[PDB]
């Protein structure tokens, strides 16, 4: 019953490649990603207003 | 082409690192309570 006592917290957000490339050194291992598969249509758990 | 996703690679120099499966297991354990709660909000 306390937010501070929580061990973990997980959030899902929409992002594009340009956002990740804004900070190139921050993110590693970008080439292996399959961009086409990871779309709001393919993820049913994410709740969004994008058509 | 098509490099294999989930090809293991050590990102950091920590003695013990998390790896993806631990985090996904935590998410799948925590999900049932969240799903039960969301019904009331809906």
């Amino acid at each position: 019953g306390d937010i501070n006592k929580a061990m973990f917290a997980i959030v899902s957000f929409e992002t594009c490649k340009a956002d990740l490339l804004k900070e190139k050194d921050r993110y590693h291992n970008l080439n292996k990603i399959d961009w086409q598969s990871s779309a709001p249509v393919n993820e049913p758990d994410h709740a969004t207003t994008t058509p | 082409p098509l490099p294999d996703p989930s090809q293991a690679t050590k990102l950091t120099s920590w003695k013990n690192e998390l790896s993806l499966q631990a985090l996904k297991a935590d998410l799948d354990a925590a999900k049932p309570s969240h799903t039960a709660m969301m019904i009331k909000v809906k």
């Binding site: 086409q36 598969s37 393919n42 049913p44 | 082409p1 098509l2 799903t35 019904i39 809906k42």
Partner: peptide, 27 residues
């Protein structure tokens, strides 16, 4: 008289290997 769970069972999308290979030319 029977509680109805909401989250329904959904199947994923079949993986496709031949389409990524092909290049596209505009007509």
């Amino acid at each position: 008289t029977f509680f109805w769970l909401k989250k329904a069972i959904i199947t994923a999308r079949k993986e496709q290997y031949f389409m990524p290979l092909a290049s596209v030319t505009n007509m």
